[PDB]
RNA sequence: ACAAACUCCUAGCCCAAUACCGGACUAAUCUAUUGAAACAUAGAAGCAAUAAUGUUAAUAUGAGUAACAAGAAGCCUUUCUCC
RNA sequence: GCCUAACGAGCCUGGUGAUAGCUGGUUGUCCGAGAAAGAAUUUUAGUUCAACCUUAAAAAUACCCCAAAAACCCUAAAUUCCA
RNA sequence: GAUUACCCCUUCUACCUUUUGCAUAAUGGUUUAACCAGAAAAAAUCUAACAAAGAGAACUUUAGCUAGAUACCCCGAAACCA
């Protein structure tokens, strides 16, 4: 009983599916496909964990710039804004810096502000005085 | 706020000379935010793909 | 052996509704098996391209090519067709439409060398296909301006978007 | 401050790998009954090629590249020019 | 030297799927677990045993481990062995 | 990866074989199609029959017997003999 393999027409098609856009002669070739095909899938799984990075590091550079605007550096931004105990994302905080500039101009003088509240605080050498925005929250 | 989109584009990715004043500085320190500026880096739009950057100046 | 090209002339279309635009003749002729190469033969089709068909037999007549004589025939077959089987008032109205070289089936020989070595010798066939149409030849595109330029960037800074950003 | 596969967070089908060794499924044939257009339970096998300076057929590239040939004029076989 | 364009021993057909501890190749998907050299050997390009390991099974203790304990002249880091 | 946008940006040392280690400047392949390489049932495990017995003859039996199912490639010398 002597068999062959009739349907080698559709194998072949379900790699060349993903070969179509190659330059050059990737796009015919199942040899030179198959190859290009499997380096295509791994790029794509690893820019699947690049692109969170790629997109964090875009967020802080708008962050930086937002807040060059206003005279303020980013780590003084980002340290104070979370000293004040508002957690906000990187992402939100970016998108507020391009959509909403007056709300951000308000953050950046919150930031500012606590800031200054903690180089009098420690400058000051006592334990008494707590600058309005030094206060801390516990929640009920 | 309320801007037609044509003019709100416009308006955006506006490319601003800078004039940057040099006797007396070093050349370092110059070209470091000389840099900065000319990449658009100072900009919250920015981003990498945009042709945003802004001329500058150095007298 | 695929012929199709042939086949073409065998269309027939519904007749005309009132007062809409007259379409044209088109006509198609080949010539199957001429024993030019096909490289060669190219670079005739490809001269006589989008030209009125008197400028392409002017040319045609002129050049040296062994290619010349085989194309030439063909387009006064191709003319002649263009008046009598189908109708077409005005003979010299016609401009080629599409010129090109197909590779035809080859012969093989051996080629000897030396040494008691040889080379396997293909010679060589062509056809060539010419897709004549009735009416007088399109405008040949002229090169950008820089007000075409100076258009096209501007829509390309007016197509930005800020990225990532919602 | 910025920085990982580490660790949180929100959901899950819930944690790497060469030699060797276990498991679960399935592509394409054929044969039993079904199935009727692509079939589903079994039983069977010449049972699945991106790699053997693989075999045959066909196509490219090198490449229109290397290399090949017909002594002159006329009235068309008649003179010339040479070996 | 030569014995029909390969002669330290012709060519052909058999023996012949000669025999290669030596190269070179060996085709679907997805999951479990996963290895580094102690012996002998015409042995060191290889095999066959041990040890580790994989797949099943039966069980009871396994690593860690405080005193206590293991040499006689001098002798460090540390071992062995156990609740 | 993405982008309004093909590029432009940013991130990545062809593939097999072979090795302690190969982007290697180690081997292999122009490309397409068709062909082209894992076979055995002693012992074992798994599923059933009947059981002090079991097998459609000869055998084996201190839970055994009988049946099924699970297994071990392809191409290459120089040679030697008629
Ligand atoms: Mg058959
Ligand atoms: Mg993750
Ligand atoms: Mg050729
Ligand atoms: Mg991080
Ligand atoms: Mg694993
Ligand atoms: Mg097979
Ligand atoms: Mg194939
Ligand atoms: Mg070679
Ligand atoms: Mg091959
Ligand atoms: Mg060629
Ligand atoms: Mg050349
Ligand atoms: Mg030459
Ligand atoms: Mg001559
Ligand atoms: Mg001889
Ligand atoms: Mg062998
Ligand atoms: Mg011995
Ligand atoms: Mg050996
Ligand atoms: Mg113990
Ligand atoms: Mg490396
Ligand atoms: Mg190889
Ligand atoms: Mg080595
Ligand atoms: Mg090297
Ligand atoms: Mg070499
Ligand atoms: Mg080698
Ligand atoms: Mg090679
Ligand atoms: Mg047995
Ligand atoms: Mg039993
Ligand atoms: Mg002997
Ligand atoms: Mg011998």
Same mark, same amino acid.
């Given at each position: 009983?002597?068999?062959?393999?009739?349907?080698?027409?559709?194998?072949?098609?379900?790699?060349?599916? =993903?070969?179509? =856009?190659?330059?050059?002669?990737?796009?015919?070739?199942?040899?030179?496909?198959?190859?290009?095909?499997?380096?295509?899938?791994?790029?794509?799984?690893?820019?699947?964990?690049?692109?969170?990075?790629?997109?964090?590091?875009?967020?802080?550079?708008?962050?930086?710039?937002?807040?060059?605007?206003?005279?303020?550096?980013?780590?003084?931004?980002?340290?104070?804004?979370?000293?004040?105990?508002?957690?906000?994302?990187?992402?939100?905080?970016?998108?507020?810096?391009?959509?909403?500039?007056?709300?951000?101009?308000?953050?950046?003088?919150?930031?500012?502000?606590?800031?200054?509240?903690?180089?009098?605080?420690?400058?000051?050498?006592?334990?008494?005085?707590?600058?309005?925005?030094?206060?801390?929250?516990? =929640?009920? | 706020?309320?801007?037609?989109?044509?003019?709100?584009? %416009?308006?955006?990715?506006?490319?601003? %000379?800078?004039?940057?004043?040099?006797?007396?500085?070093?050349?370092?320190?110059?070209?470091?935010?000389?840099?900065?500026?000319?990449?658009?880096?100072?900009?919250?739009?920015?981003?990498?793909?945009?042709?945003?950057?802004?001329?500058?100046?150095?007298? | 052996?695929?012929?199709?090209?042939?086949?073409?002339?065998?269309?027939?279309?519904?007749?005309?509704?009132?007062?809409?635009?007259?379409?044209?003749?088109?006509?198609?002729?080949?010539?199957?098996?001429?024993?030019?190469?096909?490289?060669?033969?190219?670079?005739?089709?490809?001269?006589?391209?989008?030209?009125?068909?008197?400028?392409?037999?002017?040319?045609?007549?002129?050049?040296?090519?062994?290619?010349?004589?085989?194309?030439?025939?063909?387009?006064?077959?191709?003319?002649?067709?263009?008046?009598?089987? #189908?109708?077409?008032?005005?003979?010299?109205?016609?401009?080629?439409?599409?010129?090109?070289?197909?590779?035809?089936?080859?012969?093989?020989?051996?080629?000897? #060398?030396?040494?008691?070595?040889?080379?396997?010798?293909?010679?060589?066939?062509? #056809?060539?296909?010419?897709?004549?149409?009735?009416?007088?030849?399109?405008?040949?595109?002229?090169?950008?301006?820089?007000?075409?330029?100076?258009?096209?960037?501007?829509?390309?800074?007016?197509?930005?978007?800020?990225? #990532?950003?919602?």
């Amino acid at each position: 009983l002597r068999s062959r393999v009739t349907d080698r027409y559709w194998r072949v098609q379900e790699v060349l599916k =993903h070969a179509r =856009h190659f330059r050059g002669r990737k796009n015919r070739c199942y040899r030179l496909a198959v190859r290009a095909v499997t380096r295509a899938f791994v790029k794509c799984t690893r820019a699947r964990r690049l692109k969170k990075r790629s997109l964090r590091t875009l967020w802080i550079n708008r962050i930086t710039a937002a807040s060059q605007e206003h005279g303020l550096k980013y780590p003084a931004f980002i340290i104070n804004l979370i000293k004040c105990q508002v957690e906000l994302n990187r992402k939100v905080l970016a998108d507020l810096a391009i959509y909403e500039p007056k709300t951000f101009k308000s953050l950046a003088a919150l930031a500012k502000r606590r800031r200054e509240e903690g180089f009098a605080a420690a400058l000051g050498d006592g334990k008494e005085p707590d600058g309005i925005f030094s206060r801390v929250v516990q =929640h009920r | 706020s309320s801007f037609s989109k044509a003019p709100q584009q %416009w308006a955006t990715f506006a490319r601003v %000379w800078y004039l940057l004043d040099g006797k007396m500085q070093p050349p370092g320190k110059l070209a470091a935010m000389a840099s900065v500026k000319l990449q658009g880096l100072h900009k919250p739009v920015y981003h990498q793909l945009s042709d945003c950057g802004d001329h500058v100046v150095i007298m | 052996i695929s012929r199709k090209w042939e086949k073409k002339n065998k269309i027939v279309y519904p007749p005309q509704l009132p007062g809409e635009p007259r379409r044209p003749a088109e006509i198609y002729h080949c010539r199957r098996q001429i024993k030019y190469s096909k490289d060669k033969m190219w670079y005739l089709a490809k001269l006589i391209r989008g030209m009125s068909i008197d400028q392409a037999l002017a040319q045609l007549e002129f050049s040296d090519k062994k290619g010349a004589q085989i194309i030439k025939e063909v387009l006064l077959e191709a003319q002649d067709m263009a008046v009598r089987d #189908h109708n077409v008032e005005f003979r010299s109205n016609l401009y080629v439409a599409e010129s090109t070289s197909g590779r035809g089936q080859y012969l093989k020989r051996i080629r000897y #060398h030396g040494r008691g070595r040889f080379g396997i010798m293909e010679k060589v066939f062509c #056809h060539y296909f010419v897709k004549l149409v009735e009416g007088p030849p399109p405008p040949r595109e002229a090169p950008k301006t820089a007000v075409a330029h100076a258009r096209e960037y501007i829509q390309e800074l007016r197509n930005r978007t800020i990225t #990532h950003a919602l």
